[PDB]
Curated annotation (Swiss-Prot), chain C:
Changing E103A: No effect on iron binding but the oxidation rate is severely reduced. The record marks R18 as: Essential for association with cargo receptor NCOA4. One of its GO terms (molecular function) is ferric iron binding. Expressed in the liver. Stores iron in a soluble, non-toxic, readily available form. Important for iron homeostasis. Has ferroxidase activity. Iron is taken up in the ferrous form and deposited as ferric hydroxides after oxidation. Also plays a role in delivery of iron to cells. Mediates iron uptake in capsule cells of the developing kidney. Delivery to lysosomes is mediated by the cargo receptor NCOA4 for autophagic degradation and release of iron. It comes from Homo sapiens (Human). The gene is FTH1. This is Ferritin heavy chain.
Length: 174, 174, 173, 174, 173
């Protein structure tokens, strides 16, 4: 019993996709936790909460789109525990943005290794899938998060509660 | 005389594109044959017929797009005979779907060999051309045909004409 | 034998199958003409579109014959689609003259298909050929004739300016 | 100090991107110069002038998009002098089209070298950026310019002053 | 030689127009470089970048209009190298606005000298061309840029990182 659709689909890549699914679900969990941190009455930054809730839902499509690809190529989904975030309390708008930047770089590095695995096993379809749906999305998220961390720092965060409040209204509100 | 637009276009690639053109026209000929088999009064599954006529028309678009690529890069089109399909009677809805799956996996492997030729000849444009217009189209066609074969087999085909008739109306007649 | 067959001779069935192959050939010839004019060293965009259109219309002519075959209880048997005689079509004028020759040979095979149909007292098959092919062939042969007349009177194929202007004013709407 | 966004971005690619920005700006300068040559009262080909002014704006966009990519990846833009075109007088429509074809083929090989650099430094994002936004746009420009010299030559240019006039209105004026 | 349209167009004016074309292209290059400096992830002032990107596109059009003027009067365009900006790093929003103020005032001084060259050479058409399309455009640019440095300085830039951020949103936004 091997899948009728399987073709040029190496098993290391199949396993790498299964790990990537867990990573994207994890990322979505991190964002879910950040968003409702900023919903706390003693944090109370509504657009920070909306911004991170949006990222969390985005990561959930990233996970589902990878699950879709596995079935398309004949792989078999095997899910694992979605490890809890490293933090329940994110201290500040700035820290959350700095933490988010770190998370997206780790997902990016696992995606770049997935692409190297695909090219090494000469699977051009999986590589093009990775280029089209993830690599440029990661570069845009990292840059945007970089832009955000720069601005919060120059406004005087995190020491300046006035800085985070104004960033919340003028950049994250739209 | 070498073409005034030719650049970084190996002659092996040129021959390969011409080989792919014939394969795509062959594929479309195979589908045209399937389409009108199900138009026979003793088969009479009109949605199977419409399904395969569409795939036949899409394959010709694939062939024409390869001819467009050949001229774009400065190569020269050379057409060959379009051998007839290996069957005149396609057995059943299920069997036709299985043949289509087998035909599409062969076309995918011919495209995957074309991709290895382009990268070995350091032709990033031809590789990107194959990735965006053919590789994922083949992965989606192979998966869909696989879906169709699973459902037909689980419904009791080709044993029970009631299965193929119902599949013809509820899946292909949407 | 088919449950629907009545008055459909076995020669008619075989002739319909041969006509199907001829129409697919015709469609292949036009496909090859079309992308010749797409070459960067020919670059006649409307000559390419005109011949691509005829190739699609020939594609459909064959399918109507395949539908007719199933309709009358005959059985489709396909054959190889032999390659065109040429890979390079030389000129707009020459391609048009080649097309003129091709449509007249298909017309001659349709005229013989009609003579077989009347001889075998198959009035439906005769009407099928008259309604969908005979006048369509007479219209194509005349139009192709008009095109070779004009290209010659404009000075083709010697005058490269002739083929450019014809491509723009006649084939460009 | 290294950028907070930089990841998998070699210093060789960064330097190559800065040169490509200069090349794209150069090309736009060549086209800007061609455009106003045909605005001269003693040449007076309004659609040649409009056509080449369009290409100049296109190339200027090619440069701006490369600058966007540089900042996205954490590189730093370094601009250089924009050398003059090698001509002030472009002689004829045919000659301008021939010069343009040569210019676009030189940009294509410069972009193709960027692609091999990106793959050698295992930068799949940079490889995909070049494939989607530049390689096929260069292949399309080369083919169109080739079409333009074939027709202009076949009509009798540049000897035939009538040829360039008719080409100017029937091809470039549509 | 000499142009069939040329009339009352001195060669100093012709040569001065050629220099002005190069100056406008320079200005457009300077603005292009400022704009993408504020696109850096360690600056990230999205509206500062758009403000300067707009200025670069306008200067480009200013250059194109002068090239059009050159042809209208029968002069001949001769292009020159577009020297690179004097800085790669523009320090701050305030600093970039102060440089732009400086850049626009020197280009204004180049246009004012072109105007006296036109009046001295009794070219009423070229004088009116400059007054109509450039002189008041420069007077408005100088006034706007002065306004921006005043507000940025009065808000406390560049020390106040919060000032440039708020200016980026409420004045340039
Ligand atoms: Fe993600
Ligand atoms: Fe295909
Ligand atoms: Fe016909
Ligand atoms: Fe370009
Ligand atoms: Fe100006
Ligand atoms: Na790729
Ligand atoms: Na009749
Ligand atoms: Na009739
Ligand atoms: Na005409």
């Amino acid at each position: 019993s091997t899948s009728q659709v399987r073709q040029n689909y190496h098993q290391d890549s199949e396993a790498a996709i299964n790990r990537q699914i867990n990573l994207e679900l994890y990322a979505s969990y991190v964002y879910l936790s950040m968003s409702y941190y900023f919903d706390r009455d003693d944090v109370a930054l509504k657009n920070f909460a909306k911004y991170f809730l949006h990222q969390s839902h985005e990561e959930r499509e990233h996970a589902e789109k990878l699950m879709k690809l596995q079935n398309q190529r004949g792989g078999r989904i095997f899910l694992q525990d979605i490890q809890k975030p490293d933090e329940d309390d994110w201290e500040s708008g700035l820290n959350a943005m700095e933490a988010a930047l770190h998370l997206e770089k780790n997902v990016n590095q696992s995606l770049l290794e997935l692409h190297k695995l695909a090219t090494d096993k000469n699977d051009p379809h999986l590589a093009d899938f990775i280029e089209t749906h993830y690599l440029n999305e990661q570069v845009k998220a990292i840059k945007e998060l970089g832009d955000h961390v720069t601005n919060l720092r120059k406004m005087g965060a995190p020491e300046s509660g006035l800085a985070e409040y104004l960033f919340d209204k003028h950049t994250l509100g739209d």
